[PDB]
Amino acid sequence: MLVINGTPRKHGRTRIAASYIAALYHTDLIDLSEFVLPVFNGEAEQSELLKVQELKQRVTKADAIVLLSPEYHSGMSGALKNALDFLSSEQFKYKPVALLAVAGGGLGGINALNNMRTVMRGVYANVIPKQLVLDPVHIDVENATVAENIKESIKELVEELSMFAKAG
Amino acid sequence: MLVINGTPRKHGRTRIAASYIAALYHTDLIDLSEFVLPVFNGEAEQSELLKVQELKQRVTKADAIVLLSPEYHSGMSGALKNALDFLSSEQFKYKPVALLAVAGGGLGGINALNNMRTVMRGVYANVIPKQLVLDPVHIDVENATVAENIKESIKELVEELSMFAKA
Numbered sequence A: 001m002l003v004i005n006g007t008p009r010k011h012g013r014t015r016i017a018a019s020y021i022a023a024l025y026h027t028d029l030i031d032l033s034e035f036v037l038p039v040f041n042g043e044a045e046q047s048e049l050l051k052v053q054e055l056k057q058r059v060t061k062a063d064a065i066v067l068l069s070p071e072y073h074s075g076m077s078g079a080l081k082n083a084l085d086f087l088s089s090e091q092f093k094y095k096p097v098a099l100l101a102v103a104g105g106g107l108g109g110i111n112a113l114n115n116m117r118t119v120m121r122g123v124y125a126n127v128i129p130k131q132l133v134l135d136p137v138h139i140d141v142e143n144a145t146v147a148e149n150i151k152e153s154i155k156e157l158v159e160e161l162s163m164f165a166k167a168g
Numbered sequence B: 001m002l003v004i005n006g007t008p009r010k011h012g013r014t015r016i017a018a019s020y021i022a023a024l025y026h027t028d029l030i031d032l033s034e035f036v037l038p039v040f041n042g043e044a045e046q047s048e049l050l051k052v053q054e055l056k057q058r059v060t061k062a063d064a065i066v067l068l069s070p071e072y073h074s075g076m077s078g079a080l081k082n083a084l085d086f087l088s089s090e091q092f093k094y095k096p097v098a099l100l101a102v103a104g105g106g107l108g109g110i111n112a113l114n115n116m117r118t119v120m121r122g123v124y125a126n127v128i129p130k131q132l133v134l135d136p137v138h139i140d141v142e143n144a145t146v147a148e149n150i151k152e153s154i155k156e157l158v159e160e161l162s163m164f165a166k167a
């Protein structure tokens, strides 16, 4: 199972959330704040880039992917969407994908989720029904860890993604 | 008036339509295919980058903005969204903005526009009702131009955008 951090900010919240999960379930991880890609330019030479090849492969071999992203202007981050532009249905077709968006509070996160979900259907991923929106509340920034009340929520999400991975 | 090219592909179609517009109306132009930014990282140092400052400045000083993006996986380009991440409502507040998405297959185009409209509203831009979808068939890349069909549509769009500007 592969986890993916959407925030390009090393000091980002989504990073913490991504880390937690990747640790708890001992899952593979691609941290976009460390895994810096160039901006897609649609040329072939880019495909031969090593971080591009690595991304493509790690996604293909992934039995189930957890997609995390902050809400930047009522949408997923550009860092995330950029990486996705490098890939296609060739990697995502039928791929079990759980969505997770870190809002800044209120009713935020909905647009981000629908964005990710829409783009994910674009590449034919099997996006499970369960999706989560985490507010800064559920993020302990300094202690670099998640709140307790939302640890169950995530558990349910990961467990359900597993089930989907097994079926399809 | 400012035109922004969403496709990072130098050989991109969205780039042609963008150029056409910027030339036909002698507007300002930011071509993401050439104007290559780094991936946002929410760090202050990045803010002081010269391309970033020019981005903010050129957008703030625009009286209206034509936003073009190719549909990538039923969403705007990552290059375009990344650029947007550098900005905020501070440059977009009440900004008269027109939307354009380059996409093929009758079905496509709507998802990218809904994404552009949702995000633009996330920065309080004044997105006009008129938005277009340009099919690759209506764009001659080798000759670097758009079909005569499209020109009319684009005219109506630009003029409708200038109306908002004035208002």
Ligand SMILES: Cc1cc2nc3c(=O)[nH]c(=O)nc-3n(C[C@H](O)[C@H](O)[C@H](O)COP(=O)(O)O)c2cc1C
Binding pocket: A007, A008, A009, A011, A012, A013, A014, A015, A070, A071, A072, A073, A074, A075, A102, A103, A104, A105, A108, A109, A136, B042, B085, B086, B122
């Ligand atoms: C460029 C940018 C745009 C933002 N716009 C939104 C927004 O659209 N909705 C929201 O809930 N939060 C927004 N915020 C606040 C973030 O959601 C908040 O920082 C959240 O914790 C994301 O954390 P992270 O990017 O550090 O992972 C934005 C933050 C940035 C940097």
Ligand SMILES: Cc1cc2nc3c(=O)[nH]c(=O)nc-3n(C[C@H](O)[C@H](O)[C@H](O)COP(=O)(O)O)c2cc1C
Binding pocket: A042, A085, A086, A122, B007, B008, B009, B011, B012, B013, B014, B015, B070, B071, B072, B073, B074, B075, B102, B103, B104, B105, B108, B109, B136
């Ligand atoms: C990374 C990538 C993703 C794409 N995804 C879509 C999409 O989901 N919907 C669509 O209609 N076309 C899609 N296409 C085809 C584009 O619509 C087509 O290239 C269009 O002419 C955009 O031109 P441009 O990016 O060169 O400016 C995609 C193309 C690329 C390169």
